[model samples]
Target: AVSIPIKNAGFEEPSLTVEDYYTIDTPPGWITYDPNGLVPAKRTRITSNNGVGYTGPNSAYYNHKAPEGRNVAYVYLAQEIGSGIAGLEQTLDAVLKPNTKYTLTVDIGNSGGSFQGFPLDGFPGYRVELLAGDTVLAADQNNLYIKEKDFKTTTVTFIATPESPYLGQHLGIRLINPLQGKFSGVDFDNVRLTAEPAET
Candidate 1:
């Protein structure tokens, strides 16, 4: 029998804290926040709305205003902001045991505007990728427009079977932009990673 560790890797536990708000200072093991990979004019602050959290605008990032009613924390990406991805990226330092099974759990929602891009009003989608070292172990994608106002949790499980090439030596998670047009960004919380036991 294989032993799987159940660690509190989710953001809901309060154990994880936001770093400097606008930098890649997200605590180790947690996801890193990027301002659309652009150079910001100024640093932005981490704001909260209706219990959710998000980053504000600066000179280097996209130019736009916060949406109404919806809180900043609950919304992953800002409204009418830049057209890009705004989720967390896990560190590659998370080591994965060879031939072991792992399960990833995450809570997501569309509390703000419809899953449509501002200015263009196009449908947006989000994607999740499992990484081991520099190599991609697995990837999954979903549309954000269908779940606006409805918050839900989803889980993904996969087995690690690295071949002769060992990219690095650790496991990690990454949120990427999968939509062709502009997207409002999706909110994600409580991302948990647990080791899974071998099937009987």
Candidate 2:
């Protein structure tokens, strides 16, 4: 068992109310990238929806679920990554040691509800990803739905060799609400990341 060094893997941070989160910084061991700056615009934060979905007093949530009037909807997304977007970040254990494989696991949800570009035939097919920058290592880009009530544990593994360009960069586990999809919104909790020696 390789020892891991990830802080707040379960997002046990200061819970942010609708009015409280946008002004403060991101949760520990986490980062948010939103071009519009925070508040009076758009931002991401850790929220406790009072047991809304996955038994959460705390989960990383983007857009809405804020303090009612202060909430913003990520309902209609743009296909372009440059458009309104929110992504969470983290550095892997070993800091990208060469010849290692990384595994990422987390609880993700679509908060299933019909509200935007897509009708809820079942659940809007939003995108979930593990990334090193915009480069996707693993993901469910479309037709991947989770009922508002189901925040199942999902896992993915990726390898990095000494020669790989991403060997030295941190990995990012992100959720994307791409344009014309991701209408219902998304959240994450119980995140766990680990690594092992790559095959020689």
Candidate 3:
């Protein structure tokens, strides 16, 4: 089990704007997976427009719109904006107890079919992982926050092993966009991780 206060966990910092519907990279305490800053590629975007996707004045989306559709259709804390692989992550202290369990929670959503008026299912939904360095101690990849579905809390419990390398290194909360493509959208927010005693 580990303890961590995720930075910008809700993606509501530094705000964001659409370059007509496109957005800039990164938020405070959060890092966009996109480094090339390419609009046609997978990038993280902050949106103030509730015009499409979900309802809100501000949110995060996986940016992929290009010369054709320069807009983020995926709402919630979107994992994929257009069709590029999308994700966001935060680094935390390695104050995790080995051989313990942790409960991870997050708010995620999505629209079914082409409700967003686009082919956004380029990437499936998302998964949560507890990582020490590059090693995954535990992971839950069964979150089905998809269209025609209500916004619900995704909760998964995972454990760290005694054989694991303790976090003198970096412990991270990794939100990933499974790398599969779909024609729908998924939303994510309020990521929380808490420690719990292992089941004897």
- Highest lDDT: which candidate? 3
Q: lDDT tens string, model 1, 1-200?
A: 33333222433323323421322233334544455642233424422111234323321121322231212222233433445454556554457665667776555544334222333233345566667776767766773243444445566667755442543467777654333333444445555677754442
29-65: candidate 2 lDDT, tens digit per residue: 6655443432123323322111122222332432233
Ranking by TM-score: 3, 2, 1
**Which of the two candidates, 1 or 2, achieves a greater TM-score against the reference?**
2
lDDT of each: 0.45, 0.48, 0.50
TM-scores of the candidates are 0.56, 0.58, 0.61
What is the C-alpha lDDT profile of model 3 across 1-200, one tens digit per residue? 44557776665543435432423444456444432222223433332111222233332332222111222223233334444444556677645676567787776554333334454344356677776676666677754534343345677776666665664547677665543545323455667788767753
Decreasing lDDT order of the candidates: 3, 2, 1
